[PDB]
Design a protein around this nucleic acid. Structure first.
Length: 405
RNA sequence: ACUGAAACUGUAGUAGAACCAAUCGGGGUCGUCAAUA
């Protein structure tokens, strides 16, 4: 379940709620391929495809840029049937085929990806980070969103949520540089801005629709629980009753309520009447704050090949988009982009320990992007490269034209 | 005053793009209570 956020008011935009059903993570299906060869080999591009599948490079289904679609291949087997020959036709009828060791061919050619920049952000909650679960619990009103991950459940920040906060910061930077106001515009108008329509995409309305060059994974917690352990928390009726067993079990500290609550902490909030100083009862609510939930690194994928198609192959246009992306990562590392629920209400600030920039087949001028950063201000990037980007950025600022012509 | 035969409705096409489940709220605090005879 999700919602668009109005860029002026900062609140759920009216008419922009959405729901999506998803096959859970860790679900399996067969790779079900047959290839008819008309020559005595196996095609390079098909070997490259199988390498990409084993690398996890291919996305499937909807919401590819906004949380979903990542698949990886395992147990790859190749069976050969020489249908040109009697032994191979009867093998096809009877014998289940000549086995190929994939490890031989996979070693015997270099894997080539299309251009992309991986961004892996190692982060920790500086203050509790959760997405809200849509249903109130019984003991706890506001519960973390969990998702099934294999046979377990994990806490999740959907890549929809991280995408939207990053898009919001991108759009805010551009509108500042232009001193452009989105107060009058409607939500769809508020989103249409230059350089963000390519990094994040534009809705397909009849067409300015574009898929985002930038894709964000669902980020799951390093903590996991059995499904019935989390149901025990969801069903818990009493915060100091059966919730304490349930939270002790789920956090993995069944005999230490202290260590359990250093991971998942129940928190009461009360609104105080200004005239009387009384708890404005009925305005009491409770949050299960994931104060000590550890999270896997945020995986962001910039499809550099997608940007090139938008900019018509000329990589000089890439530099203003790359510049914006680095300016957004500078804000993400400086705690300026809180994530999830309750960001003005004591949650959502993150530490960024490390940004790993992992470009495959990058052009030589963006090759300085292949870096692991630990300064939040990106000074691990070569100053000549950052000045190079800074110049192309400043030129675009002077004429904030639509690169995409 | 003699049944035609034989012929794969297939071939190419990702149900997808876009959308932050979010906004506000100190876990807080002081005057009685009761109605008869």
């Amino acid at each position: 379940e999700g919602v668009g956020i109005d860029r002026h008011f900062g609140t759920a935009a009216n008419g922009f709620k959405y729901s999506r059903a998803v096959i859970p993570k860790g679900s399996k299906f067969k790779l079900p391929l047959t290839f008819d060869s008309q020559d005595d080999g196996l095609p390079n591009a098909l070997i490259q495809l199988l390498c990409a599948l084993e690398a996890g490079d291919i996305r499937l289904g909807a919401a590819k840029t906004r949380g979903l679609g990542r698949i990886k291949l395992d147990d790859l087997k190749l069976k050969s049937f020489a249908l040109d020959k009697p032994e191979g036709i009867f093998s096809a009828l009877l014998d289940q085929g000549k086995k190929l060791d994939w490890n031989q061919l996979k070693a015997n050619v270099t894997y080539q990806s299309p251009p992309y920049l991986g961004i892996s952000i190692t982060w920790n909650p500086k203050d509790p980070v959760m997405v809200k679960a849509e249903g109130d619990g019984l003991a706890i009103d506001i519960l973390p969103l969990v998702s099934q991950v294999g046979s377990d459940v994990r806490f999740v920040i959907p890549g929809s949520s991280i995408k939207g906060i990053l898009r919001t910061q991108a759009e805010r930077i551009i509108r500042t540089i232009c001193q452009s106001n989105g107060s009058e515009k409607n939500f769809l108008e508020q989103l249409r801005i230059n350089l963000v329509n390519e990094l994040f995409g534009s809705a397909s309305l009849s067409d300015l629709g574009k898929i985002g060059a930038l894709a964000v994974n669902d980020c799951f917690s390093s903590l996991s629980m059995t499904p019935d352990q989390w149901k025990a928390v969801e069903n818990a009726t009493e915060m100091t009753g059966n919730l304490q067993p349930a939270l002790k079990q789920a956090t993995g500290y069944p005999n230490n309520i202290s260590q359990a609550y250093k991971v998942l902490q129940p928190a009461m909030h009360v609104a105080v009447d200004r005239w009387t100083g009384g708890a404005a009862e009925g305005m009491l609510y409770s949050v299960l704050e994931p104060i000590g939930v550890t999270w896997e690194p945020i995986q962001v994928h910039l499809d550099i090949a997608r940007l090139k198609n938008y900019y018509h192959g000329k990589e000089e246009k890439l530099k203003p988009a790359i510049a914006l992306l680095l300016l957004v990562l500078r804000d993400l590392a400086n705690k300026k982009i809180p994530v999830g629920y309750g960001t003005n209400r004591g949650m959502g600030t993150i530490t960024v320990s490390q940004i790993t920039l992992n470009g495959k087949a990058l052009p030589t001028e963006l090759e300085p992007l292949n870096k692991t950063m630990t300064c939040p201000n990106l000074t691990d990037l070569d100053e000549a490269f950052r000045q190079d980007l800074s110049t192309a950025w400043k030129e675009w600022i002077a004429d904030p034209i639509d690169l995409c012509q």
